[PDB]
Structure formats: C-alpha cells, structure tokens
Amino acid sequence: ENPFKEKLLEIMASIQTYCQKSPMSDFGTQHYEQWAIQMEKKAAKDGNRKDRVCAEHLRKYNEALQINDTIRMIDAYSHLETFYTDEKEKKFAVLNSLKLDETDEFLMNLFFDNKKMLKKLAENPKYE
Numbered sequence: 841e842n843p844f845k846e847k848l849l850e851i852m853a854s855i856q857t858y859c860q861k862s863p864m865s866d867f868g869t870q871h872y873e874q875w876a877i878q879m880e881k882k883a884a885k886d887g888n889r890k891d892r893v894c895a896e897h898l899r900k901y902n903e904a905l906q907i908n909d910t911i912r913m914i915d916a917y918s919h920l921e922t923f924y925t926d927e928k929e930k931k932f933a934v935l936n937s938l939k940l941d942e943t944d945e946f947l948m949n950l951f952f953d954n955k956k957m958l959k960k961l962a963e964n965p966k967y968e
Contacts, residue, residue, distance in 0.1 A: 868905030
C-alpha cells in the first residue's frame with residue numbers, strides 16, 4: 841500500500857471533513873472529478889466560497905491521484921506543488937486577511953504541512 845497515495849487520500853478526506861462533504865465516488869476517479877465539478881459549480885452559483893474553493897482543491901488532489909496511476913509519483917507531487925505555489929503567488933504577490941480567509945489558510949497549511957513528507961515519498965524509487 842503505497843504511502844504516497846495513502847497520504848493523498850488522507851488529505852482529501854480531511855478537506856471533505858472541513859467542508860462537510862461525503863460523496864460516494866471513490867477518490868482518484870473520473871466520477872469523483874465530476875462530483876467535484878458539480879459541487880464547485882453549485883457553490884459558485886450559490887455564493888458559497890468555502891464549498892467552491894474546497895471543490896477546486898479537491899479536484900487538484902483527485903487529478904494528482906490519477907496522474908500517479910498513469911505516470912509517476914513525482915508528476916503527481918509536482919501537479920500539487922505547482923498549484924499551491926501558484927495559489928500562494930496569487931494571494932501574496934500584489935497587495936492593493938486580504939484574500940486569505942479561514943478556508944484558504946486551512947487548505948494551504950494542509951498542503952505545506954505535508955509537502956516535505958510527500959516529496960520524500962514521491963522521490964523514493966521503491967514505491968514507484
């Protein structure tokens with residue numbers, strides 16, 4: 841049971857807890873991607889920022905699991921690192937809380953608290 845994949849699954853479960861969602865779709869599937877898209881879409885339509893941003897982030901983790909299955913661990917890690925590095929750049933690069941609310945801080949801290957561990961696992965030839 842690959843520890844890298846297990847860590848990603850645990851993180852998605854933690855995000856689902858935060859936004860109180862519990863879809864029947866399995867993590868890392870196309871059907872999960874579709875659930876997240878609908879939820880993101882309904883959230884934007886209903887002005888629910890927490891749900892919308894959580895759906896967006898869950899999509900990225902779901903895509904990383906799909907990338908892990910079809911390519912390599914390191915492409916999966918990079919998919920997330922790039923997204924979170926960019927989100928960080930978006931948030932703090934230009935300054936006119938600002939764009940950082942409790943949802944944003946929860947999600948970014950969730951990734952960056954696990955970032956070092958994830959990279960260690962993804963760099964390990966044994967689980968590839």
